[PDB]
Design a binder for this molecule. Sequence first.
Ligand SMILES: CC(C)C[C@H](NC(=O)[C@@H](NP(=O)(O)CNC(=O)OCc1ccccc1)C(C)C)C(=O)O
Ligand SMILES: [Ca+2]
Ligand SMILES: [Ca+2]
Ligand SMILES: [Ca+2]
Ligand SMILES: [Ca+2]
Ligand SMILES: [Zn+2]
Length: 316
Amino acid sequence: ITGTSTVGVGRGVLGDQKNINTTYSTYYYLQDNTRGNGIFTYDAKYRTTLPGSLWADADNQFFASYDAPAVDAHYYAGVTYDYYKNVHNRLSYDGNNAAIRSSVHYSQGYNNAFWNGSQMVYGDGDGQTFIPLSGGIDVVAHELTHAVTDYTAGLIYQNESGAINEAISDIFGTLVEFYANKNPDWEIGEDVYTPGISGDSLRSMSDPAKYGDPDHYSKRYTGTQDNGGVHINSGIINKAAYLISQGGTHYGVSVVGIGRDKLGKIFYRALTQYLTPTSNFSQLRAAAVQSATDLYGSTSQEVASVKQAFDAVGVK
Ligand SMILES: CC(C)C[C@H](NC(=O)[C@@H](NP(=O)(O)CNC(=O)OCc1ccccc1)C(C)C)C(=O)O
Ligand SMILES: [Ca+2]
Ligand SMILES: [Ca+2]
Ligand SMILES: [Ca+2]
Ligand SMILES: [Ca+2]
Ligand SMILES: [Zn+2]
């Protein structure tokens, strides 16, 4: 919409107050003009036609319970934008500041979120398994990251390349959570998953087995569910990623941690310069080794740790 940039205030899904960038033109719209070619948040109004209506508000105050999911979708999209620009020098998901669009209140009781090829989509959850999913910064960065992947490596969404696609979104969803540095962890979706149960999450990168996901290649799922287990087999790469950053001894294999920042640089480089739509785990190991080599030299600790990590999850 054409208008003048403003700043609204409201409350997100977890009750936190935050400033949001809006645009004023009779109404205040959830349109942030301060980043790239804008960040736009839409109301799907509990239906499934997308994107729905650009979020319109009469007074630039977003404290209603109905406003909360939009507030967090809009704000965490901005945090994710900032991560890619400030940390990887990437402008929006396409690298050329494409407009970023999100819809909230999608469908009824919808226990998921996704990238539909053109925009992010967030259900409200059924209130038991989930609360509105945009309340999770890792979830928002996971989704936006699916866009980054689609514009870059293009990892096909099935079997091993699909588990890599998924791990990539969990890794950067996690790196963004640490970047915002509000209660960060190596867990996925803990802020919005099962309001009645403390301490659980969708997935764990540090111990995928905790929620039934493999942490070794010999435990990979090869059935047909979940597109060949893309949300299951991602645990093998997630673990490898957690190990590279934090170190550890896994099935007797010891890994010297190198830190999140180097983990993000190596995986960012693998994602945009070496992965292809059909890469498999073994090809991801080589991409990561070549990326660490590029950034830190073939004799660095970094390359050595990347090797240790893939050994540890049984990926050759
Ligand atoms: C929601 C969770 C219980 C499990 C899981 N979803 C997730 O882990 C994450 N959602 P996601 O983005 O991976 C769902 N992706 C997804 O459904 O992709 C299918 C698709 C949709 C539109 C166009 C092309 C392809 C998010 C919730 C962190 C799943 O879809 O299995
Ligand atoms: Ca209002
Ligand atoms: Ca957290
Ligand atoms: Ca998390
Ligand atoms: Ca919970
Ligand atoms: Zn995903």
